[PDB]
């Protein structure tokens, strides 16, 4: 799989904060949580 991060499903949002993490974010159900929600 050349791609693994880039290719989220269509309602999150990865987005990084002001020390560098990064965490997903949804704007349907705007919740925060720390996963990868892709299936292959």
Not at 23 to 31: E, K, L, S
């Amino acid at each position: 799989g050349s791609s693994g991060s880039s290719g989220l499903p269509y309602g999150w949002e990865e987005a990084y904060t002001a020390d560098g993490i990064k965490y997903f974010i949804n704007h349907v159900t705007q919740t925060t949580s720390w996963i990868h929600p892709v299936m292959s």
